């Protein structure tokens, strides 16, 4: 499913992401925009053989099991396919564990390079939340 900007903001807010660990909603929406372009089905393979899955591009080397990443740790205890669902619950639950890992949202390279230090508030502007 390809989410609309405000639709995603609302779903994320409903799932408890607004201000989770100090990161306002705009940060999460901005990250999803640049990580997957709001597409729940997005996948991208990396040079190390691991693959990124879903709306938040969660990596198979540490967070989910895809059956093809030797040494995967599966810290979120879910098959990576669960992260491609139109229902973002699994992605959100796993993202909460990732952002609590110590490096915060820097875990997401697109957030660090394209959202961090920008007016992220613009990402939820105009939305009925």
JSON list of C-alpha atoms in Angstrom, two decimals:
[
{"chain": "A", "resi": 1, "resn": "UNK", "atom": "CA", "xyz": [0.00, 0.00, 0.00]},
{"chain": "A", "resi": 2, "resn": "UNK", "atom": "CA", "xyz": [1.21, 3.52, -0.86]},
{"chain": "A", "resi": 3, "resn": "UNK", "atom": "CA", "xyz": [0.22, 5.82, 1.98]},
{"chain": "A", "resi": 4, "resn": "UNK", "atom": "CA", "xyz": [-0.72, 9.45, 1.56]},
{"chain": "A", "resi": 5, "resn": "UNK", "atom": "CA", "xyz": [1.24, 11.87, 3.74]},
{"chain": "A", "resi": 6, "resn": "UNK", "atom": "CA", "xyz": [-1.52, 12.71, 6.25]},
{"chain": "A", "resi": 7, "resn": "UNK", "atom": "CA", "xyz": [-2.90, 9.18, 6.25]},
{"chain": "A", "resi": 8, "resn": "UNK", "atom": "CA", "xyz": [0.49, 7.87, 7.38]},
{"chain": "A", "resi": 9, "resn": "UNK", "atom": "CA", "xyz": [0.91, 10.61, 10.00]},
{"chain": "A", "resi": 10, "resn": "UNK", "atom": "CA", "xyz": [-2.45, 9.62, 11.51]},
{"chain": "A", "resi": 11, "resn": "UNK", "atom": "CA", "xyz": [-1.66, 5.89, 11.53]},
{"chain": "A", "resi": 12, "resn": "UNK", "atom": "CA", "xyz": [1.75, 6.52, 13.11]},
{"chain": "A", "resi": 13, "resn": "UNK", "atom": "CA", "xyz": [0.25, 8.83, 15.74]},
{"chain": "A", "resi": 14, "resn": "UNK", "atom": "CA", "xyz": [-2.39, 6.23, 16.50]},
{"chain": "A", "resi": 15, "resn": "UNK", "atom": "CA", "xyz": [0.40, 3.68, 16.90]},
{"chain": "A", "resi": 16, "resn": "UNK", "atom": "CA", "xyz": [2.19, 5.83, 19.48]},
{"chain": "A", "resi": 17, "resn": "UNK", "atom": "CA", "xyz": [5.05, 7.25, 17.42]},
{"chain": "A", "resi": 18, "resn": "UNK", "atom": "CA", "xyz": [4.49, 10.99, 17.97]},
{"chain": "A", "resi": 19, "resn": "UNK", "atom": "CA", "xyz": [7.27, 11.98, 20.36]},
{"chain": "A", "resi": 20, "resn": "UNK", "atom": "CA", "xyz": [8.32, 8.39, 20.97]},
{"chain": "A", "resi": 21, "resn": "UNK", "atom": "CA", "xyz": [11.81, 8.63, 22.48]},
{"chain": "A", "resi": 22, "resn": "UNK", "atom": "CA", "xyz": [11.67, 12.38, 21.89]},
{"chain": "A", "resi": 23, "resn": "UNK", "atom": "CA", "xyz": [11.13, 12.29, 18.13]},
{"chain": "A", "resi": 24, "resn": "UNK", "atom": "CA", "xyz": [8.16, 14.30, 16.92]},
{"chain": "A", "resi": 25, "resn": "UNK", "atom": "CA", "xyz": [5.78, 12.88, 14.31]},
{"chain": "A", "resi": 26, "resn": "UNK", "atom": "CA", "xyz": [7.31, 14.90, 11.50]},
{"chain": "A", "resi": 27, "resn": "UNK", "atom": "CA", "xyz": [10.59, 12.98, 11.96]},
{"chain": "A", "resi": 28, "resn": "UNK", "atom": "CA", "xyz": [8.87, 9.61, 11.41]},
{"chain": "A", "resi": 29, "resn": "UNK", "atom": "CA", "xyz": [6.91, 10.80, 8.37]},
{"chain": "A", "resi": 30, "resn": "UNK", "atom": "CA", "xyz": [10.02, 12.38, 6.85]},
{"chain": "A", "resi": 31, "resn": "UNK", "atom": "CA", "xyz": [11.98, 9.16, 7.41]},
{"chain": "A", "resi": 32, "resn": "UNK", "atom": "CA", "xyz": [9.27, 7.02, 5.75]},
{"chain": "A", "resi": 33, "resn": "UNK", "atom": "CA", "xyz": [9.11, 9.42, 2.79]},
{"chain": "A", "resi": 34, "resn": "UNK", "atom": "CA", "xyz": [12.80, 9.11, 2.01]},
{"chain": "A", "resi": 35, "resn": "UNK", "atom": "CA", "xyz": [13.23, 5.50, 3.04]},
{"chain": "A", "resi": 36, "resn": "UNK", "atom": "CA", "xyz": [10.36, 4.01, 1.04]},
{"chain": "A", "resi": 37, "resn": "UNK", "atom": "CA", "xyz": [8.41, 6.87, -0.50]},
{"chain": "A", "resi": 38, "resn": "UNK", "atom": "CA", "xyz": [5.46, 5.76, 1.71]},
{"chain": "A", "resi": 39, "resn": "UNK", "atom": "CA", "xyz": [5.31, 2.34, 0.05]},
{"chain": "A", "resi": 40, "resn": "UNK", "atom": "CA", "xyz": [4.84, -0.60, 2.47]},
{"chain": "A", "resi": 41, "resn": "UNK", "atom": "CA", "xyz": [6.09, -3.03, -0.16]},
{"chain": "A", "resi": 42, "resn": "UNK", "atom": "CA", "xyz": [9.51, -1.44, -0.73]},
{"chain": "A", "resi": 43, "resn": "UNK", "atom": "CA", "xyz": [12.58, -3.70, -0.51]},
{"chain": "A", "resi": 44, "resn": "UNK", "atom": "CA", "xyz": [16.23, -2.95, -1.19]},
{"chain": "A", "resi": 45, "resn": "UNK", "atom": "CA", "xyz": [19.15, -5.35, -1.06]},
{"chain": "A", "resi": 46, "resn": "UNK", "atom": "CA", "xyz": [22.47, -4.29, 0.38]},
{"chain": "A", "resi": 47, "resn": "UNK", "atom": "CA", "xyz": [26.04, -5.18, -0.55]},
{"chain": "A", "resi": 48, "resn": "UNK", "atom": "CA", "xyz": [26.46, -7.27, 2.59]},
{"chain": "A", "resi": 49, "resn": "UNK", "atom": "CA", "xyz": [23.63, -9.52, 1.35]},
{"chain": "A", "resi": 50, "resn": "UNK", "atom": "CA", "xyz": [21.06, -8.26, 3.87]},
{"chain": "A", "resi": 51, "resn": "UNK", "atom": "CA", "xyz": [17.82, -6.62, 2.67]},
{"chain": "A", "resi": 52, "resn": "UNK", "atom": "CA", "xyz": [15.78, -3.61, 3.89]},
{"chain": "A", "resi": 53, "resn": "UNK", "atom": "CA", "xyz": [12.01, -4.07, 4.21]},
{"chain": "A", "resi": 54, "resn": "UNK", "atom": "CA", "xyz": [8.95, -1.90, 4.19]},
{"chain": "A", "resi": 55, "resn": "UNK", "atom": "CA", "xyz": [7.85, 1.60, 4.98]},
{"chain": "A", "resi": 56, "resn": "UNK", "atom": "CA", "xyz": [10.80, 2.13, 7.35]},
{"chain": "A", "resi": 57, "resn": "UNK", "atom": "CA", "xyz": [13.31, -0.09, 5.49]},
{"chain": "A", "resi": 58, "resn": "UNK", "atom": "CA", "xyz": [14.13, -2.32, 8.45]},
{"chain": "A", "resi": 59, "resn": "UNK", "atom": "CA", "xyz": [17.27, -4.43, 7.93]},
{"chain": "A", "resi": 60, "resn": "UNK", "atom": "CA", "xyz": [17.37, -8.25, 7.87]},
{"chain": "A", "resi": 61, "resn": "UNK", "atom": "CA", "xyz": [20.85, -8.53, 9.43]},
{"chain": "A", "resi": 62, "resn": "UNK", "atom": "CA", "xyz": [19.58, -7.54, 12.90]},
{"chain": "A", "resi": 63, "resn": "UNK", "atom": "CA", "xyz": [15.84, -7.04, 13.04]},
{"chain": "A", "resi": 64, "resn": "UNK", "atom": "CA", "xyz": [13.85, -9.56, 11.04]},
{"chain": "A", "resi": 65, "resn": "UNK", "atom": "CA", "xyz": [14.34, -12.99, 9.55]},
{"chain": "A", "resi": 66, "resn": "UNK", "atom": "CA", "xyz": [14.17, -13.42, 5.77]},
{"chain": "A", "resi": 67, "resn": "UNK", "atom": "CA", "xyz": [15.82, -16.81, 5.62]},
{"chain": "A", "resi": 68, "resn": "UNK", "atom": "CA", "xyz": [18.65, -15.58, 3.43]},
{"chain": "A", "resi": 69, "resn": "UNK", "atom": "CA", "xyz": [20.89, -13.43, 5.64]},
{"chain": "A", "resi": 70, "resn": "UNK", "atom": "CA", "xyz": [23.54, -15.62, 7.31]},
{"chain": "A", "resi": 71, "resn": "UNK", "atom": "CA", "xyz": [24.04, -14.54, 10.91]},
{"chain": "A", "resi": 72, "resn": "UNK", "atom": "CA", "xyz": [20.79, -12.57, 11.10]},
{"chain": "A", "resi": 73, "resn": "UNK", "atom": "CA", "xyz": [19.83, -11.83, 14.71]},
{"chain": "A", "resi": 74, "resn": "UNK", "atom": "CA", "xyz": [16.06, -11.27, 14.28]},
{"chain": "A", "resi": 75, "resn": "UNK", "atom": "CA", "xyz": [15.75, -8.93, 17.27]},
{"chain": "A", "resi": 76, "resn": "UNK", "atom": "CA", "xyz": [12.14, -8.05, 16.42]},
{"chain": "A", "resi": 77, "resn": "UNK", "atom": "CA", "xyz": [11.14, -11.75, 16.14]},
{"chain": "A", "resi": 78, "resn": "UNK", "atom": "CA", "xyz": [9.16, -11.55, 12.93]},
{"chain": "A", "resi": 79, "resn": "UNK", "atom": "CA", "xyz": [9.63, -12.75, 9.38]},
{"chain": "A", "resi": 80, "resn": "UNK", "atom": "CA", "xyz": [10.71, -9.77, 7.23]},
{"chain": "A", "resi": 81, "resn": "UNK", "atom": "CA", "xyz": [7.61, -10.29, 5.03]},
{"chain": "A", "resi": 82, "resn": "UNK", "atom": "CA", "xyz": [5.42, -9.15, 7.95]},
{"chain": "A", "resi": 83, "resn": "UNK", "atom": "CA", "xyz": [7.00, -5.70, 7.47]},
{"chain": "A", "resi": 84, "resn": "UNK", "atom": "CA", "xyz": [5.54, -5.36, 3.97]},
{"chain": "A", "resi": 85, "resn": "UNK", "atom": "CA", "xyz": [1.92, -5.51, 5.12]},
{"chain": "A", "resi": 86, "resn": "UNK", "atom": "CA", "xyz": [-0.56, -2.68, 4.49]},
{"chain": "A", "resi": 87, "resn": "UNK", "atom": "CA", "xyz": [-1.05, -2.65, 8.28]},
{"chain": "A", "resi": 88, "resn": "UNK", "atom": "CA", "xyz": [2.00, -0.85, 9.70]},
{"chain": "A", "resi": 89, "resn": "UNK", "atom": "CA", "xyz": [1.76, -2.30, 13.22]},
{"chain": "A", "resi": 90, "resn": "UNK", "atom": "CA", "xyz": [4.74, -4.70, 12.89]},
{"chain": "A", "resi": 91, "resn": "UNK", "atom": "CA", "xyz": [6.91, -2.03, 11.29]},
{"chain": "A", "resi": 92, "resn": "UNK", "atom": "CA", "xyz": [6.01, 0.42, 14.04]},
{"chain": "A", "resi": 93, "resn": "UNK", "atom": "CA", "xyz": [6.62, -2.09, 16.87]},
{"chain": "A", "resi": 94, "resn": "UNK", "atom": "CA", "xyz": [10.00, -3.05, 15.46]},
{"chain": "A", "resi": 95, "resn": "UNK", "atom": "CA", "xyz": [10.92, 0.62, 14.78]},
{"chain": "A", "resi": 96, "resn": "UNK", "atom": "CA", "xyz": [10.30, 1.37, 18.47]},
{"chain": "A", "resi": 97, "resn": "UNK", "atom": "CA", "xyz": [12.93, -1.22, 19.43]},
{"chain": "A", "resi": 98, "resn": "UNK", "atom": "CA", "xyz": [15.40, 0.13, 16.82]},
{"chain": "A", "resi": 99, "resn": "UNK", "atom": "CA", "xyz": [15.14, 3.79, 17.95]},
{"chain": "A", "resi": 100, "resn": "UNK", "atom": "CA", "xyz": [15.60, 2.67, 21.59]},
{"chain": "A", "resi": 101, "resn": "UNK", "atom": "CA", "xyz": [18.86, 0.91, 20.61]},
{"chain": "A", "resi": 102, "resn": "UNK", "atom": "CA", "xyz": [21.16, 3.78, 21.59]},
{"chain": "A", "resi": 103, "resn": "UNK", "atom": "CA", "xyz": [21.69, 5.70, 18.36]},
{"chain": "A", "resi": 104, "resn": "UNK", "atom": "CA", "xyz": [18.13, 6.93, 18.07]},
{"chain": "A", "resi": 105, "resn": "UNK", "atom": "CA", "xyz": [16.90, 7.79, 14.58]},
{"chain": "A", "resi": 106, "resn": "UNK", "atom": "CA", "xyz": [20.46, 7.90, 13.17]},
{"chain": "A", "resi": 107, "resn": "UNK", "atom": "CA", "xyz": [19.84, 4.18, 12.64]},
{"chain": "A", "resi": 108, "resn": "UNK", "atom": "CA", "xyz": [18.03, 5.35, 9.49]},
{"chain": "A", "resi": 109, "resn": "UNK", "atom": "CA", "xyz": [20.55, 6.78, 7.02]},
{"chain": "A", "resi": 110, "resn": "UNK", "atom": "CA", "xyz": [17.90, 8.70, 5.07]},
{"chain": "A", "resi": 111, "resn": "UNK", "atom": "CA", "xyz": [16.68, 10.35, 8.28]},
{"chain": "A", "resi": 112, "resn": "UNK", "atom": "CA", "xyz": [20.20, 11.35, 9.22]},
{"chain": "A", "resi": 113, "resn": "UNK", "atom": "CA", "xyz": [20.99, 12.73, 5.75]},
{"chain": "A", "resi": 114, "resn": "UNK", "atom": "CA", "xyz": [17.68, 14.29, 4.71]},
{"chain": "A", "resi": 115, "resn": "UNK", "atom": "CA", "xyz": [15.49, 14.93, 7.77]},
{"chain": "A", "resi": 116, "resn": "UNK", "atom": "CA", "xyz": [17.81, 15.57, 10.67]},
{"chain": "A", "resi": 117, "resn": "UNK", "atom": "CA", "xyz": [18.06, 19.29, 11.39]},
{"chain": "A", "resi": 118, "resn": "UNK", "atom": "CA", "xyz": [15.40, 20.29, 8.86]},
{"chain": "A", "resi": 119, "resn": "UNK", "atom": "CA", "xyz": [11.94, 21.74, 9.53]},
{"chain": "A", "resi": 120, "resn": "UNK", "atom": "CA", "xyz": [10.32, 18.30, 9.93]},
{"chain": "A", "resi": 121, "resn": "UNK", "atom": "CA", "xyz": [7.16, 19.98, 11.15]},
{"chain": "A", "resi": 122, "resn": "UNK", "atom": "CA", "xyz": [6.38, 20.67, 7.49]},
{"chain": "A", "resi": 123, "resn": "UNK", "atom": "CA", "xyz": [5.72, 16.93, 6.97]},
{"chain": "A", "resi": 124, "resn": "UNK", "atom": "CA", "xyz": [2.52, 17.02, 9.02]},
{"chain": "A", "resi": 125, "resn": "UNK", "atom": "CA", "xyz": [1.44, 20.51, 8.06]},
{"chain": "A", "resi": 126, "resn": "UNK", "atom": "CA", "xyz": [-2.18, 20.64, 6.98]},
{"chain": "A", "resi": 127, "resn": "UNK", "atom": "CA", "xyz": [-3.09, 17.25, 8.44]},
{"chain": "A", "resi": 128, "resn": "UNK", "atom": "CA", "xyz": [-6.13, 16.58, 10.61]},
{"chain": "A", "resi": 129, "resn": "UNK", "atom": "CA", "xyz": [-4.48, 14.87, 13.59]}
]
